[PDB]
Design a protein around this ligand. Structure first.
Ligand SMILES: Nc1ncnc2c1ncn2[C@@H]1O[C@H](COP(=O)(O)CP(=O)(O)OP(=O)(O)O)[C@@H](O)[C@H]1O
Ligand SMILES: [Mg+2]
Ligand SMILES: [Mg+2]
Ligand SMILES: [Mg+2]
Lengths: 271, 247
């Protein structure tokens, strides 16, 4: 079935061993930074589930490297666009992650400069949506700037529950050097957070990209028209209603370009 | 050999037929844009060989679609930071639309913000990557606003050394130049009737020799094969524990 195919392609496991998943992912982070010779990692901490989990894994990874005699550091960075509605949750996340370094970069001035320039050049005002993507892509630039200046790798937060819908910004939050959450469903991510002892609030808030000026904190589920419980059931191979299968398989097919490098005439995935 | 593996992985042909390459690459653009149902393409025009070639192919592609009764447009955009060659490229490409977006104010806002937030000045090298990534945002902003696909200028001679900014000029939706070495691209521009001025630690001709399957000194192949290995991350999606190419 297509469900089984998508499951394989996204590396999802119907049932997991929380402790073992954490070791595998921390071990991957260690192996990768060791191979590349990088000084550590950098990641934007939004206060949301995904960055909280990836962030804690990163801190654990560098603490493990130092413990064994190596050198590594993790820079957690707040990337608010002006005043962030849920800054308090981002602070709670930082409190849990306990990163080596806690930095901050307000992207508003950069996004405003770009937005003002766009209107000046074209006479058109960016739609709230397109301006939102400028925000997501500016956060990418900020993390890579810190990464290039400090010699760190940029961590990405993509996972199966996001990959299946393609709900992320190409070259924005989708742009990163390595991904510790690949294959995890949304509920499985929560399970790892539980194993890591995160404060319940960090995994009970509605997932949101929060990129719109006119509709801040817009939930993923509202925009997608499907819940994470349905998405996770589908990914974990459970028996789901036909409506869920049709919806997800349609989105997966349409967003394949987001999961592949740029298309060339030698590729067949787009035909 | 490693040279054969790389040659194969980058889709390089030792010998090419200029006219058919143009036909195949124009047909690729047409086929992809129709499949996705997009309204056309957008590409930053720098005045350099690569963007001049990709741009002309893009324009030929949209004119062909319209000739066959479809709807398509190509937006060529200048992305200066704060020119004659670019102007010349535009005169040759003859795009449906000619836009411009000065990235200066954006990069400056970012640079000043970085300094005030970290107390550190953005070095020249890192600021350069910011400029490249800002051009990416600019092209994608236009693409998102106008329903257009972002074209990339990547080719074999550029891919092998991985010398391009990840998520900068490396960020695009489709690549019409894949597989071509630097001189083959030059050959295509020549066949397209482009003026000489437009198509004219290691040299490009040396790199093209390696890619096209010619004999090269150890120092060369050694360096190129190592450069390739260390920049593989630029030719793949973000690395996960399920990947092995980085090992
Ligand atoms: N305001 C912000 N501050 C810092 N980083 C941010 C940010 N908004 C987005 N990011 C970065 O972009 C990534 C993607 O964001 P999201 O898609 O919303 C997942 P999340 O926000 O981390 O958990 P979530 O599903 O609870 O929303 C985040 O994990 C984070 O690295
Ligand atoms: Mg996300
Ligand atoms: Mg979020
Ligand atoms: Mg300092």
């Amino acid at each position: 079935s297509m469900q089984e195919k998508i499951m394989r392609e996204l590396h999802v496991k119907p049932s997991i061993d929380p402790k073992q998943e954490i070791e595998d992912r921390v071990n991957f982070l260690k192996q990768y930074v060791k191979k590349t010779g990088a000084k550590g990692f950098v990641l934007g901490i939004s206060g949301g589930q995904d960055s909280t989990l990836a962030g804690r894994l990163a801190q654990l990874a560098v603490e493990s490297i130092r413990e064994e005699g190596g050198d590594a550091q993790f820079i957690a960075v707040r990337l608010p666009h002006g005043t962030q509605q849920d800054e308090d949750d981002a602070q709670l996340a930082l409190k849990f992650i306990k990163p080596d370094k806690s930095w901050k970069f307000d992207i508003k001035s950069t996004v405003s400069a770009f937005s003002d320039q766009y209107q000046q050049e074209t006479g058109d005002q960016l739609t709230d949506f397109n301006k939102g993507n400028v925000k997501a892509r500016t956060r990418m630039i900020a993390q890579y700037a810190i990464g290039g200046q400090e010699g760190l790798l940029v961590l990405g937060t993509d996972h199966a529950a996001e990959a299946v819908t393609g709900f992320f910004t190409k070259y924005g939050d989708g742009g990163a050097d390595l991904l510790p959450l690949t294959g995890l469903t949304k509920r499985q991510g929560r399970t790892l957070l539980k194993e890591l002892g995160a404060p319940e609030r960090l995994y009970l808030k509605e997932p949101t990209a929060d990129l719109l000026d006119e509709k801040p904190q817009q939930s993923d589920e509202t925009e997608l028209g499907i819940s994470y419980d349905e998405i996770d059931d589908y990914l974990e191979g459970k028996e789901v209603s036909a409506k869920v299968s049709e919806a997800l398989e349609k989105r997966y097919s349409m967003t394949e370009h987001k999961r592949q490098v740029p298309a060339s005439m030698f590729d067949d995935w787009w035909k």
